[PDB]
Design a protein around this motif. Structure first.
Motif, mmCIF file in Angstrom:
data_model
loop_
_atom_site.group_PDB
_atom_site.id
_atom_site.type_symbol
_atom_site.label_atom_id
_atom_site.label_comp_id
_atom_site.label_asym_id
_atom_site.label_seq_id
_atom_site.Cartn_x
_atom_site.Cartn_y
_atom_site.Cartn_z
ATOM 1 N N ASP A 14 0.691 -1.412 0.151
ATOM 2 C CA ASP A 14 -0.395 -0.020 0.231
ATOM 3 C C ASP A 14 0.663 1.314 0.039
ATOM 4 O O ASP A 14 0.599 2.528 -1.254
ATOM 5 N N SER A 18 1.910 4.386 -2.643
ATOM 6 C CA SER A 18 1.519 5.585 -2.575
ATOM 7 C C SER A 18 2.781 6.476 -3.112
ATOM 8 O O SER A 18 2.765 7.693 -3.304
ATOM 9 N N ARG A 21 2.911 7.184 -6.546
ATOM 10 C CA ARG A 21 1.914 8.887 -7.390
ATOM 11 C C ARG A 21 2.748 10.113 -7.028
ATOM 12 O O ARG A 21 2.537 10.583 -7.674
ATOM 13 N N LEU A 256 0.420 15.203 4.069
ATOM 14 C CA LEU A 256 -0.703 15.099 3.203
ATOM 15 C C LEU A 256 -1.983 13.993 4.351
ATOM 16 O O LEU A 256 -1.418 13.836 5.573
ATOM 17 N N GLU A 257 -2.820 13.813 4.279
ATOM 18 C CA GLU A 257 -3.757 13.245 4.480
ATOM 19 C C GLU A 257 -4.291 11.565 4.147
ATOM 20 O O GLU A 257 -3.370 11.171 3.709
ATOM 21 N N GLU A 258 -4.091 11.181 5.289
ATOM 22 C CA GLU A 258 -4.042 9.348 5.834
ATOM 23 C C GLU A 258 -5.241 8.403 5.303
ATOM 24 O O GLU A 258 -5.183 8.267 4.906
ATOM 25 N N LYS A 259 -6.569 9.586 4.268
ATOM 26 C CA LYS A 259 -7.340 9.055 3.992
ATOM 27 C C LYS A 259 -7.054 8.305 1.943
ATOM 28 O O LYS A 259 -6.578 7.565 1.534
ATOM 29 N N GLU A 260 -6.373 9.496 2.010
ATOM 30 C CA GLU A 260 -6.537 9.585 0.531
ATOM 31 C C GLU A 260 -4.879 8.427 0.253
ATOM 32 O O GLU A 260 -4.425 7.726 -0.884
ATOM 33 N N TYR A 261 -3.945 8.763 0.908
ATOM 34 C CA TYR A 261 -2.719 8.155 0.968
ATOM 35 C C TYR A 261 -2.152 7.304 1.676
ATOM 36 O O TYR A 261 -2.225 7.416 2.926
ATOM 37 N N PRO A 262 -2.404 6.141 2.281
ATOM 38 C CA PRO A 262 -2.634 5.397 3.105
ATOM 39 C C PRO A 262 -1.287 5.200 3.722
ATOM 40 O O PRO A 262 -0.232 5.227 3.079
ATOM 41 N N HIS A 265 0.898 9.845 6.300
ATOM 42 C CA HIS A 265 0.672 11.071 6.942
ATOM 43 C C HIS A 265 1.575 10.757 8.813
ATOM 44 O O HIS A 265 1.595 10.894 10.023
#
Ligand SMILES: *[C@@H]1O[C@H](CO)[C@@H](O)[C@H](O)[C@H]1NC(C)=O
Ligand SMILES: *[C@@H]1O[C@H](CO)[C@@H](O)[C@H](O)[C@H]1NC(C)=O
Lengths: 402, 100, 50, 50
Positions: A14, A18, A21, A256-262, A265
């Motif tokens: 995962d 990330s 990207r 960054l946010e932990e939702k879109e990029y697992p 954060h």
């Protein structure tokens, strides 16, 4: 400009996806964009890798980035050699010299054999897994006859997760037969945490022991639980967190946010994912150097079926290799340079010891300088000297005949 | 070659494999349900649809070392036939405390 | 059977029985007795020490 | 800090020995003695626990 590339990512990887990207965004240009065709497959199954690869070949890809396991590595190395498709990967270095393979992971074998020579070891335990191959294991076995060591290698790979707590403690009861105080863990960052979880449970991390984590990600695994036992713990780190290039990377990564990029954060990054980001820069800087050198890589058309007979290696593929292998950019994994084979060269693996205040860098390894210490000051104990005055008179204080 | 026999509608395949190609046989056999008969070195584990004619030599060597009562010997190996028998004398090197 | 790269590859049914036939074959050969367990490994074999 | 290895020895001075988690200091090597007021082997307790 849309550059069709193939993407092979493991079903579990995962964080590795990330980072694939972010490089797409940081190295995007108005000259060209890369269009990743991503296949989420099981890297261990050789059949799934085969048609994922045959999917990308028929879809007209110029290069493929992915991962291989010790099982499916033959499927990648054999298919990429006939169909002349370039392959980029952060996985473990391969066994020998293979064409059309860009191995982002530097060779750790040489870096490990130097650390054992620094600590002046002569009898230790080598707990290895068959996941990342045993090329590093063959590196200490062939070198065992030269320097005459005594290594007790245990295949820690075969461990059932239900009888894990039993086979692990029973394992170290065999190392306790030799009063073993030096153990080498040649595992991925995940098995390190499990073994460490078992070392602490049976309390074999106190003063006397000494561990060396043989992977490019020392600070990857949780080292704060064997931080206060008493045993010295060493390891290897490929992602330097004091560079300004990575500091700017962390400043953007940790926000960054932990939702879109697992798993993004955080203020750290795994060595496998750090090579993935550096793999994208090389791929962008390879097709960017193919534009500057004037080389038409636009496919003639449909490559057809991978199982073509006789297989047609389309010509523009062999040029893509020479572009990738000539990339010499700077990224997370330090200076990136390859040789005519594909192994990382001119790299720098950091030797890291574990103390109380956290990790601590003590030096580095270069394939031409071997191990080199840094910042020897200051010593642990500044022992003062005592001045003893006396008078010369026999037979109390005399001078020798020599 | 396996994809040729598959489309040609074969029922069982008799062949060989090397250390490099053994993963390809067992994976395609497990996915397409093709029996494979082979005299090559036995596989390392329980692989489906693999009829290994060669008997597992691992135990026979461990007992032969145990017969002669050896304690310090040299184990010359080639990477050809795999190293299944290599881990056998390495995992047992700690149980019986040899010096290989 | 189509192309091996079938997506999704659906396995032919009559192939699973061929394994049980082979793994249950218990005949005599040049390598002594021949028997396979559920894994395909040789069992009941005889390796002669020389 | 690894003070649960062979050599140390702790006494849990409360009536609830099996109340907290003990599986973690169970294999370190040190001995851990304690007191229990609820015996899980008595027949009145097992019909209660059931
Ligand atoms: C090797 O790496 C060093 C890093 O300091 C760099 O200065 C040098 O130019 C590199 N050599 C080549 C041939 O890229
Ligand atoms: C076990 O091996 C012997 C050796 O010849 C053989 O006669 C016997 O049939 C084998 N057992 C089975 C159940 O096949």
């Amino acid at each position: 400009n849309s550059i069709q590339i193939g993407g092979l990512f493991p079903r579990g990887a995962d964080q590795e996806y990330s980072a694939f990207r972010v490089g797409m965004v940081q190295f995007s240009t108005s000259e060209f964009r890369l269009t990743p065709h991503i296949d989420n497959l099981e890297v261990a199954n050789s059949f799934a890798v085969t048609n994922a690869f045959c999917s990308q070949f028929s879809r007209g890809v110029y290069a493929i980035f992915g991962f291989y396991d010790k099982k499916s590595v033959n499927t990648i190395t054999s298919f990429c050699g006939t169909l002349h498709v370039s392959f980029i990967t952060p996985s473990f270095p391969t066994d020998g010299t293979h064409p059309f393979v860009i191995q982002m992971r530097p060779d750790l074998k040489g870096a490990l054999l130097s650390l054992i020579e620094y600590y002046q070891w002569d009898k230790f335990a080598y707990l290895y897994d068959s996941d990342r191959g045993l090329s590093t294991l063959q590196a200490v076995l062939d070198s065992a006859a030269e320097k005459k060591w005594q290594v007790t290698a245990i295949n820690v790979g075969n461990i059932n997760n239900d009888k894990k707590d039993e086979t692990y403690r029973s394992l170290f009861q065999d190392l306790e037969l030799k009063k073993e105080r030096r153990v080498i863990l040649d595992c991925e960052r995940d098995k390190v945490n499990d073994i460490v979880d078992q070392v602490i449970t049976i309390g074999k991390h106190v003063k006397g022991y000494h561990y060396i984590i043989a992977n490019l990600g020392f600070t990857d695994g949780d080292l704060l639980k064997i931080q206060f036992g008493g045993a010295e713990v060493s390891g290897f780190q490929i992602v330097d967190y004091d560079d300004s290039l990575v500091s700017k990377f962390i400043e953007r990564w940790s926000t960054l946010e932990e939702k879109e990029y697992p798993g993004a954060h955080t203020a750290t990054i795994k060595y496998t994912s750090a090579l993935t980001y550096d793999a994208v820069q090389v791929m962008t800087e390879a097709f960017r150097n193919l534009r500057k050198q004037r080389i038409e890589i636009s496919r003639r058309g449909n490559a057809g079926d991978c199982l073509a007979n006789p297989a047609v290696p389309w010509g523009q593929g062999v040029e893509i290799e020479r572009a990738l292998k000539q990339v010499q950019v700077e990224g997370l994994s330090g200076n990136i340079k390859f040789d005519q084979n594909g192994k990382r060269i001119n790299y720098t693996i950091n030797i890291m010891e574990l103390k109380t205040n956290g990790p601590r860098k003590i030096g580095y390894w270069s394939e031409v300088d071997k191990m080199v210490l840094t910042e020897d000051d200051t010593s642990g104990l500044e022992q003062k000297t005592v001045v003893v005055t006396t008078i010369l008179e026999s037979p109390y204080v005399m001078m020798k005949k020599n």
